[PDB]
Structure 1
Amino acid sequence: HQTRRWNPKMKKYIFTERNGIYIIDLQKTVKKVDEAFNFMREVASDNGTILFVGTKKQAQESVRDEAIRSGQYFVNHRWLGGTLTNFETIQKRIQHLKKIEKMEADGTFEVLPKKEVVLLKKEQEKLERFLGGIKDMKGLPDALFIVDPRKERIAVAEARKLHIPIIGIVDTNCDPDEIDYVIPANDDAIRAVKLLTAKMADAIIEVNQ
């Protein structure tokens, strides 16, 4: 971002300074994204999965579209804590979701009273909003993808405690050590996030097809 709120642990990746903000060197970025494409290719063809975490709005739409295109698993709304550690409780909740959806779609669509609208629809809508792509996550994600690491501390902490690789774009205002494998990019403009996430999904598809 600006030259005030920045992390000195990323002075390697800054290059000169325009009037107002820092300027990121691009050659390091192209080397990093080539390496990231290679690693995503190495990891995708394993009958596993790759998780997408859309913290900010740009990330929201971008990761939703890219995951749907690639058929992967993603989280889009607020990341409720404990998905990668309380996975028992999360899977209980998603089993609840599947059962209620099945019964509402098949059985009767009318239990007994006029009490479906008051709670039994609003809570289902809210839970479907929060969970989203977890309804298909069979096991444990192999490599998270985060747009803004400093705006998603809970997810990176939960992944690092379970010790699974992390890939993500680190702006100048983040510490590039919590994420084990980094690409320096601006996570504030909708254009760049789309390009990077689409490249990651394309690499996954090309390797795993």
Structure 2
Amino acid sequence: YWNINLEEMMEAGVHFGHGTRKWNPRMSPYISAKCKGIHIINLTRTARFLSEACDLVFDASSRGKQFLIVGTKNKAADSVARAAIRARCHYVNKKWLGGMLTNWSTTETRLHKFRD
């Protein structure tokens, strides 16, 4: 059991806090305290900044706009590969080649060469 059964239940488990002394002083209003070296991120402001982030993507999916989910990191590669097949959107996974999001015209010629 926890406090309440909502979205704040799963976020209060093992889904918060990361950086240890490698932080950027620009993200200062987005933290609570520094417990045992690790910087604990505030769940009160994340829930408000997740709401306005979920309001614009819902206002884009109703129109029929396309999304792109990038993730070349080893600890996030397997989760980025499954989430985009279910959503039918663009995704990068393996080695990141310089110029994929801007140079779509030069990289799609390689995709047509794969089909040739």
Quick check: TM above 0.5?
A: yes
**1:15 aligned onto 2:32:** yes
Percent identical among aligned pairs is 39
3-state DSSP of counterpart to 1:66 = helix
Q: C-alpha displacement at 1:51, in angstroms?
A: 0.3
Aligned-partner Cα distance in 1 for 2:107–2:65: 19
Match of 2:97 among 80, 85, 94: 80
Return the TM-score normalized by structure 1: 0.44
Shift >6 Å, 4+ stretches: none
Q: Give ranges in structure 1 of 5+ residues lacking alignment.
A: 100-209
Aligned partners of 1:87, 1:56: CA distance in 2, in Å?
21
Write the mapping of 1:47-126 to structure 2, written as runs, cut at 5 A. 47-99=64-116
The residue identity in structure 2 corresponding to 1:55 is T
Higher helix share: 1
The superposition leaves residues 149-201 of structure 1 with CA deviations (integer Å, 9 ceiling, x where unpaired) of: xxxxxxxxxxxxxxxxxxxxxxxxxxxxxxxxxxxxxxxxxxxxxxxxxxxxx
CA distance in 2, matches of 1:98, 1:53: 23
Greater RCO structure (CA 8 Å; 6+ sep) = 1
SS of equivalent residue, structure 1 residue 8? coil
TM-score norm. by structure 2 comes to: 0.77
Matched, 1:39 2:53: no
Distance 1:76 1:6 in 2: 26
Q: Secondary structure at the match of 1:16?
A: strand
Shift of 1:73: 1.5
Deviation at 1:10, TM superposition (A): 0.6
| Residue of structure 1 equivalent to 2:42 | 25
RMSD: 1.3
Please give the alpha-carbon distance, in whole angstroms, between the structure 2 residues aligned to 1:87 and 1:21. Answer: 39
Q: Write out per-residue CA displacement over residues 124-155 of structure 1, whole angstroms, 9 at most, x where no aligned residue.
A: xxxxxxxxxxxxxxxxxxxxxxxxxxxxxxxx
Tell me by how many angstroms 1:55 deviates: 2.5
Unaligned runs of 5+ in 2: 1-18
CA shift, 1:38, in A, is 0.7
- For 2:61 and 2:75, locate their aligned partners in 1 and report how far apart those are by CA, in whole Å: 24
Q: 1:14: how far off?
A: 1.0
Alpha-carbon offset, residue 74 of structure 1: 0.8
